[model samples]
Target: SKGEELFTGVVPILVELDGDVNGHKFSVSGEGEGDATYGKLTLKFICTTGKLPVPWPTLVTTFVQCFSRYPDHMKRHDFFKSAMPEGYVQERTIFFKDDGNYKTRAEVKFEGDTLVNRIELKGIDFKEDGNILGHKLEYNYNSHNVYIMADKQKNGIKVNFKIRHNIEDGSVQLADHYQQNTPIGDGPVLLPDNHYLSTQSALSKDPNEKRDHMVLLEFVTAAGI
Candidate 1:
C-alpha cells in the first residue's frame, strides 16, 4: 500500500542538521512539528547556512524583490525593509560555486498560520535532453518532527518525506522494481531512487520556462491536538 497517511496531529519538534560539505559543523535545534495525514506543520528553523551574523536582510529583501507571488512575501518584504541588520548584503548566489547541486530557483510562497504551513518552490532547469524541474511544497511540525511534500510536474517521480528531525533515526528506505514489471506509462521510472531524488522542478506561466524565485521554507504540518 502507499505509505500510511500520518494522522497524528502536530506538536513541537526539533531538528539538528550536522555536516556541511564546506568546512563547518552544522547543527541547529528549534521548535518544529507536523503530521503527514492531516497536512499541517511548523518550524522556527534557526540554522547557520554558512556563517554567523547571516545576511537576513538580504535573504528577505531579495526573496521579496525577486519572488513576490509567494504567500506572505509582501509581509516579509515590509518587515525586512523596516529593520534589518546593518551591513547586510546579498550572500553570494549559492549554486554558482557548486557548493551544492545547482537547482535554480525562481519563486517561493508561504501559505499561512494554519495547523500546517503551505509553501511552493518554483524553478526551471532545462537539461540537454529537454526535461524541466520544479516543485510545490507543503511543510508542518508537531511533536518534534517535520514533513516535506514535493508535488510533481512533467514526467518526474513523486516523493513523500517523513523525517524525525532528530539526528537519530536517520535510516532511509528505497523500493525498486525487483521484477521487470513496468506500470507507470509514458515513462517507466528508469531508476526509482534516482528518479525521485534527482528529479527537478520549476514554476512558470509556461511549464517549459523556469520560474524566477528563491525560497527557504520552514513550518509545521499539524496542530490542535
Candidate 2:
C-alpha cells in the first residue's frame, strides 16, 4: 500500500536550518505548526544574518516588489500575489494522489530576477498582502509540501517544508528530503525509506555538529533535490 498519509490534520514540527545567502551565513532554529490534511502550516525563522535586523521583513519587501510593478495584472490577482517575487518558478509535485514518477500538476515560472516564497492552504495559494504584509505568516492535504527557490544572483535559497495535521502523530515527513525508488512505469522497483533520519548515514559531510545541517541534497528519485 502507499505510505500512510499521517500528519494531515494540524501538527507542529521543529525547523532547524543552517545555510548561506551570498557570503553571509545564517542559522534558524525554531518550531512551526500546521494542518497538512487541510494544507495549512505556519513557520517562524528566527535567523542571524547581519544583512538585516529582521530577515523575514526584508524578504517580504522584496517579495511584494516583484508583483507591485504589474498592478493592472495584479489587481485581479489573489491578495497572496503580493508576496511572490518576479522571476521565480513554481510547480506542484504530487506523490501519491495519482501519477507515475511523481508528476507535476502545474507549473508557473517567471523571467529575470525573482523571489519564490509561497504558502498554500486547502489548495489555495496564500501570500503576504499589503494589509497583512509583514504582519504574520502561516499550510495541507495530499501528503505533500511546497518547494520554494528564491534567487537574486547569489542571494538564493531553496526550501522544502513538510506540513502535517495539528493532531497527527509521530514525525511529519518531507518528500523532498528523501529519495524514492523507481516508479511503476519504469519497471520493477523498490520503494524507498522516506524518513529523514534514514538518509543521514549516506551524507558525504554532516551539515550539523549533531545532525546533517544544510547539506546539498542528492538528485535521487524524481521528486527529491
Candidate 3:
C-alpha cells in the first residue's frame, strides 16, 4: 500500500526559522499539516551568500509578509503590528555552534492500550540539499521513525514530527511535542514506569508557533542532558 489515506483529520504544523551564519543570511518558510495518515508537512527555505530580507517570525506575521497576494495582509499587518514580536529580532533565532547529529524523541500511545512507547525521531529524511529558495519542501508521507529534516542551506536543523502506525491490537498515536522554558512548561519528562499518559490534537491554519522555537530539535529522552 502507498500508506493509508487517513480520514482522521489533520494536525497543523508551521515553522519559520532565521539565522546569521557568520553573516550569511539563512531562513525557513512554512505552512502545512498532517492528518490521520500523512504529515504533508510542506515548507520552503533560503540561504544567501550575502543577505535578503528576513521573513516574518510568527505564523500570522508570515502570512502578512509572505503571501502578500491578499489585501487581508494589510489588515492583519496592522493588527499584528500592534502586538507582533519585534520584527525577526532576538528570541526567535536559535544559534547552532555545531552542525551535525542531533536527537529527538516522540511519545507514542495507543488507543485501548496503556503503555506509552518512546520512539526516537531522526532528521535528514527531511533534510534540504540545495543552495536557496523558491516553491516549497514537503515530507509528503510518514517515512521513518526518525526523519532528519536538516537545513543544508547550512548545518543546523529544526523539528519534524511523526504519525500513527498500526501494530497488533491498538491504534497508535505518535507526535513531536515542543515544550518551553517557562514557569509551567518544560522539556519532555519521564513518568513512572507504570504511569500512563495521553494526548489529543487537530490541524488548523492558526497553528500556534509561539512556543520556544529552536534551530535543532532533538528531544533528549532519559534525562541526562
Candidate 4:
C-alpha cells in the first residue's frame, strides 16, 4: 500500500515555501535541522496573508496522487480537467484537482548575547478554494492579529498563538481555477491557528487545542530546530 521511508542524515525537503494568493503574501521560512530518519528535527518560521487548499503534507500528497496517476490517455491540460466536480471542499477540490492558493509562514527571534527565543506572529491567514458542482468559489480566514509569542525560562516556557479566527470572506466566491476558499476537511468550516505555527518550532501543546477558537504557541526551541 503506502509507506514512509525512515532514513538519516539528510532532509532534502526541509526548506522554505512561499507565494501569493490573489496578491496577499505567504512564506514558511526559518531555521531547521535534523535526521527524522533517526530521531527527527526540523523547524521554520511560517506565516501567511492568504489561503491554501490544504496543509503542506496533505497538499503535496494530493498533488502527488493527481499527477502521478497521469491518465494513460489524457494529455497534461486535459488531465487537469475534472468531472470530479469543482469548488466542493478539501478532498474534491484540492486533493482531487490539485487546485488552490494557500500560504504558511514561520519566524523565531532572539536578542542579547544570551538567548530568549521569542515568537512574534502578528496573525495567521488561511484561504480555502473550491467550486459548487463546478461553479467555483472561495472562503477566507484570518487570526486577525491575535498576537502570538513564546520564550523559555528556568521554570517554564512562555508562548501564545490561540485566538478566535477571523473569517473575512466565508461566502462561496466564484473564480476561474476550480473556485474559492476551503479547509483541509469537510463541512461548512473555518479553522483555528492550530500547530501550523508549531510545525516549524518543533513545539507542542497539551490540549491539542483543536477548538473552534485559536490557541497560543509556546516557544519550545529555536534554540531548537
- The prediction achieving the highest lDDT against the true structure is 2
TM-score of 4: 0.23
lDDT of 1 by residue, 118-216 (tens): 111111222222111111112211122211122233322232322211111342211111101111233222212211111111211223423222223
Error of 2 at 95 (Å): 26
RMSD of each: 20.4, 19.9, 19.1, 20.3
Can you write out model 3's per-residue Cα lDDT over 61-173, one digit (the tens) per residue? 11111111112222222111121121111111121112112123322222131112222222222113211121121212222332222222322222233334222234332
User: For model 2, what is the alpha-carbon lDDT of residue 15?
Assistant: 39
- Which lDDT value does model 2 have at 30? 38
lDDT of 2 by residue, 125-218 (tens): 2123311122221111233332333333323223344332211233232222211111212222122222111110011223344431222111
The per-prediction tally of clashing pairs is 44, 21, 11, 39
- TM-score for all predictions? 0.26, 0.26, 0.24, 0.23
Q: In candidate 4, how many Å is residue 41 off?
A: 4.1
Total backbone collisions, model 3? 11
- Cα RMSD, model 2: 19.9
How far residue 136's Cα lies from its native spot in candidate 2, in Å, is 19
Q: What is the alpha-carbon lDDT for the whole of candidate 2?
A: 0.25
Q: Which stretches of candidate 1 lie over 4 Å from their true place?
A: 1-6, 48-225
What's the lDDT for all of these models?
0.23, 0.25, 0.23, 0.24
